[PDB]
Scaffold this active site. Structure first.
Site, PDB file in Angstrom:
ATOM      1  N   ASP A  29     -33.142 -82.685 -26.843  1.00 42.42           N
ATOM      2  CA  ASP A  29     -33.803 -81.404 -26.897  1.00 42.42           C
ATOM      3  C   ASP A  29     -33.865 -80.882 -25.470  1.00 42.42           C
ATOM      4  O   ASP A  29     -33.584 -79.710 -25.212  1.00 42.42           O
ATOM      5  CB  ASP A  29     -35.195 -81.565 -27.505  1.00 42.42           C
ATOM      6  CG  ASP A  29     -35.153 -82.258 -28.857  1.00 42.42           C
ATOM      7  OD1 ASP A  29     -34.170 -82.048 -29.607  1.00 42.42           O
ATOM      8  OD2 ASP A  29     -36.104 -83.004 -29.169  1.00 42.42           O
ATOM      9  N   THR A  41     -37.897 -84.919 -28.725  1.00 39.73           N
ATOM     10  CA  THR A  41     -39.172 -84.565 -29.329  1.00 39.73           C
ATOM     11  C   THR A  41     -39.010 -84.781 -30.837  1.00 39.73           C
ATOM     12  O   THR A  41     -38.853 -83.832 -31.610  1.00 39.73           O
ATOM     13  CB  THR A  41     -39.520 -83.094 -29.026  1.00 39.73           C
ATOM     14  OG1 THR A  41     -38.526 -82.228 -29.599  1.00 39.73           O
ATOM     15  CG2 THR A  41     -39.561 -82.876 -27.529  1.00 39.73           C
ATOM     16  N   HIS A  47     -38.417 -89.762 -38.446  1.00 35.38           N
ATOM     17  CA  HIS A  47     -38.017 -90.958 -37.724  1.00 35.38           C
ATOM     18  C   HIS A  47     -38.922 -92.150 -37.795  1.00 35.38           C
ATOM     19  O   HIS A  47     -38.977 -92.956 -36.869  1.00 35.38           O
ATOM     20  CB  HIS A  47     -37.775 -90.636 -36.274  1.00 35.38           C
ATOM     21  CG  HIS A  47     -36.811 -89.523 -36.068  1.00 35.38           C
ATOM     22  ND1 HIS A  47     -35.836 -89.554 -35.100  1.00 35.38           N
ATOM     23  CD2 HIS A  47     -36.714 -88.317 -36.661  1.00 35.38           C
ATOM     24  CE1 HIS A  47     -35.184 -88.410 -35.101  1.00 35.38           C
ATOM     25  NE2 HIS A  47     -35.698 -87.640 -36.037  1.00 35.38           N
ATOM     26  N   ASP A  75     -30.684 -92.860 -34.702  1.00 33.20           N
ATOM     27  CA  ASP A  75     -31.294 -92.770 -33.377  1.00 33.20           C
ATOM     28  C   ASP A  75     -30.819 -93.948 -32.546  1.00 33.20           C
ATOM     29  O   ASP A  75     -30.332 -93.771 -31.436  1.00 33.20           O
ATOM     30  CB  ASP A  75     -32.820 -92.829 -33.441  1.00 33.20           C
ATOM     31  CG  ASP A  75     -33.422 -91.772 -34.338  1.00 33.20           C
ATOM     32  OD1 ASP A  75     -32.798 -90.707 -34.551  1.00 33.20           O
ATOM     33  OD2 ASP A  75     -34.545 -92.007 -34.825  1.00 33.20           O
TER      34      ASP A  75
END
Ligand code: ZN
Length: 134
Positions: A29, A41, A47, A75
């Site tokens: 981001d 963020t 998540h 991720d």
DNA sequence: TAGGCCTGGATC
DNA sequence: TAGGCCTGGATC
């Protein structure tokens, strides 16, 4: 939306940063060349943050738990590539930027500072501090 | 705007 | 990574 609450502080320290780049994994981001690091963020739900804002839905549970899992998985991968490309990663969860436990606007800058600039292993910033990424 | 629910959504 | 609803406040 929440990116701002944090973004507002960035320029607050001048810090040279770009935004949401699709050329970097996990499309960060905030991207900072001033230190070769990127911030994230992440919403606490998508998540799976083991924080108060995470609640397994009571409908299609299996469909959400599996969809979420793949996110964490994405991720992990994302971060790993970034790290591979000489990037330092920092995750700031929403639970610590919005909500009834959100870090006082002070603690952040105060924590972002010791990080961003003063070097340090990738890590994540939550409602109860900042720890090594893991 | 404060958060608390309830679901998927739009894209790529 | 949401946007639509609904509540309850602070700003004016
Ligand atoms: Zn959280």
């Amino acid at each position: 939306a929440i990116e701002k609450r944090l973004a507002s502080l960035l320029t607050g320290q001048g810090l040279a940063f770009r935004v949401q780049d699709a050329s970097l994994p996990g499309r960060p981001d905030f991207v900072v060349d001033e230190y070769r690091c990127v911030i994230f963020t992440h919403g606490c739900f998508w998540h799976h943050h083991h924080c108060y804002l995470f609640k397994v839905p009571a409908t299609r549970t299996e469909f959400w738990l599996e969809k979420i899992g793949k996110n964490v998985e994405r991720d992990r991968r994302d971060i790993s590539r970034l790290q591979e490309l000489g990037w330092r990663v920092l995750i700031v969860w929403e639970c610590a930027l919005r909500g009834r436990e959100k870090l006082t606007d002070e603690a952040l800058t105060e924590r972002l500072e010791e990080w961003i600039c003063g070097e340090g292993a990738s890590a994540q910033i939550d409602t109860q501090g900042i720890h090594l990424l893991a």
